[PDB]
Design brief:
Chain C: The modification Phosphoserine is found at residue 64. The complex is a heterotrimer of chains A (73), B (304) and C (102). Chain A is an all-beta fold. Chain A has strands at residues 26-28, 43-44, 51-60, 63-72. The radius of gyration of chain A is 21 Å and the shape is elongated. Classes of the chains: A mainly beta (73), B alpha/beta (304), C alpha+beta (102). Bound molecules: adenosine-5'-triphosphate (2 copies) and adenosine monophosphate.
């Protein structure tokens, strides 16, 4: 009959994938106040005074809005 | 003139057509402290923010400079009587404090609705901020204003098979307000100015000298500047001193005469990117105001 | 609105991160599927509106010691009242973060 043996993938999913193909870890929007695949991704400011600021850019037809939600914790 | 190139253009364009390729939108949860919310407006360089009720899971209203004005006036009078509730109010709690039985539900417009419908809704509801909300998503896409609408009209009608009414004066068309003009003087304290805003429901006050000549303009826009300060105690200062906090060279107040054509007024307003002109006589004495509201109301009821 | 950070970062073990997010998802009554050991698809029924919202979670390595949890909303397929896909996405992320992190 003989016992059968298992060769197991291992690795690939040892360690999470590295971040940047083109996805930016930090966005600076000082500006004295055209990017690809950051659409639909959650962005945030550092928490301040028990308030979260969550943000994302979404597309409606050919228009893009960056929405910010200020939300107590 | 009548039936208008304007009326037809407005009926044949969707609200979507005026949304910029890219914009930002600030939304507040109604549990947010009022004080933090108004500071966020300044921070983000934004008038108007839709309000989201998390329990109800819906947009319930807008937060504007007017709301800030109502709150400060209330705060200022309450403090003199040692009541300090207001500035620890959440958006929710202030809303129930004034939206009592008095019901003002959120007014919005679909991206697929006509620009005519937008203009009518703004006028009918006596409002300056019309959120464009996608019915399929429930997402607010943009907040539509009179300024944006007029600019769009100026630009995309800018051909002229021209209505006869465009060559007629504000005088003959009777566009503008020419009585009971709410104004202040150089020395008028900010809290007095607040009271006037609260009573008259008016977006700006001409600042006049001893002879009633206009020398400056105190807008509600200039009022959220106070949300940047940490004390709110500087409401006793004059309108003049409060206006020092402006960004830019203040070239002067943008004026017009009663005898200028609607065309010239529309052109000046769109290029200046301001909400109103102060109507003035030969000698700078204020005779009235012509606002973006006045113009859009005229264009929708067919010019003048 | 000056310095914006993608998702949230952690120096916790990647296995601990994923395991804890999965426990949060289940505690929150969301449904999920494991696409990869570091990539989850989640689906939530709005207990008020009865609508369904989907999002993706992806863990990344940003340092030798640091990981980034990334949240991405998945696009579906007069007065408004109930629902906004975008706001609901934020609340989903917020609920998930609160219920599994720090
Ligand atoms: N789309 C809307 N639906 C319901 N209520 C609104 C809407 N927009 C504004 N309001 C409310 O109406 C009142 C005045 O709003 P308005 O938009 O005129 O204020 P504003 O933006 O300060 O205008 P302005 O500075 O031009 O006077 C506020 O109490 C505000 O919350
Ligand atoms: N007639 C005028 N002359 C000179 N400056 C003006 C005039 N009207 C407004 N301003 C200034 O322009 C700035 C913008 O004010 P405005 O009243 O247009 O508010 P806004 O938010 O830009 O307009 P809107 O409410 O239509 O979007 C303010 O600082 C105000 O003092
Ligand atoms: N200071 C003011 N005094 C009296 N009426 C005004 C004043 N400012 C604006 N109005 C009028 O009020 C209406 C709404 O204007 P606005 O507040 O500018 O949107 C318009 O008919 C304006 O002409």
């Amino acid at each position: 009959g003989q016992e059968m043996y298992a060769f197991r993938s291992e690795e690939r999913f040892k360690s999470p994938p590295i971040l940047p193909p083109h996805l930016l870890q930090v966005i600076l929007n000082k500006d004295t106040n055209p990017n690809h695949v950051m659409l639909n991704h959650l962005y945030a400011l550092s928490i301040k005074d028990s308030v979260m600021v969550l943000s994302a850019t979404h597309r409606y037809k050919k228009k893009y809005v960056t929405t910010l939600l200020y939300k107590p914790i | 003139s009548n039936s208008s190139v304007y009326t037809t253009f407005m009926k044949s364009h969707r609200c979507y057509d005026l949304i910029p390729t890219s914009s930002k939108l600030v939304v507040f949860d109604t549990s947010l402290q009022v004080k933090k919310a108004f500071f966020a407006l300044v921070t983000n360089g934004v008038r108007a923010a839709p309000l989201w009720d998390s329990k109800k899971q819906s947009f319930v209203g807008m937060l504007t400079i007017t709301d800030f004005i109502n709150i400060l006036h209330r705060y200022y009078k309450s403090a003199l009587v040692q009541i300090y509730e207001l500035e620890e109010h959440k958006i929710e709690t202030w809303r129930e404090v004034y939206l009592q039985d008095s019901f003002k539900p959120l007014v919005c417009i679909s991206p697929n609705a006509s620009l005519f419908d937008a203009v009518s809704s703004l006028i009918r509801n006596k409002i300056h901020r019309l959120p464009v909300i996608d019915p399929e998503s429930g997402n607010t896409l943009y907040i539509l204003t009179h300024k944006r609408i007029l600019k769009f009209l100026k630009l995309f009608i800018t051909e002229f098979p021209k209505p006869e009414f465009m060559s007629k004066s504000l005088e003959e068309l009777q566009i503008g307000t020419y009585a009971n003009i709410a104004m202040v003087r150089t020395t008028t304290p900010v809290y007095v100015a607040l009271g006037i805003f609260v009573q008259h429901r008016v977006s700006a006050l001409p600042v006049v000298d001893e002879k009633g000549r206009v020398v400056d303009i105190y807008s509600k826009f200039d009022v959220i500047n106070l949300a940047a300060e940490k004390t709110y105690n500087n409401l006793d200062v004059s309108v003049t001193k409060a206006l020092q906090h402006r960004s830019h060279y203040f070239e002067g107040v943008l004026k017009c005469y009663l005898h200028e054509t609607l065309e010239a007024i529309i052109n000046r307003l769109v290029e200046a990117e301001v909400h109103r002109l102060v109507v003035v006589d030969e000698h700078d004495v204020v005779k009235g105001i012509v606002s973006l509201s006045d113009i859009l109301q005229a264009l929708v009821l067919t010019g003048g | 609105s000056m310095a914006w950070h993608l998702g949230i970062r952690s120096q916790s073990r990647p296995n601990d991160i994923m395991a804890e997010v999965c426990r949060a998802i289940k505690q929150l009554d969301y449904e999920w599927k494991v696409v990869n050991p570091y990539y989850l698809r989640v689906r939530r029924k709005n207990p008020v509106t009865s609508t369904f919202s989907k999002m993706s979670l992806q863990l990344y390595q940003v340092d030798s010691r640091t990981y980034l949890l990334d949240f991405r909303s998945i696009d579906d397929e007069v007065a408004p009242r109930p629902g906004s896909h975008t706001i609901e996405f934020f609340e989903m992320c917020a609920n998930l973060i609160k219920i599994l992190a720090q």
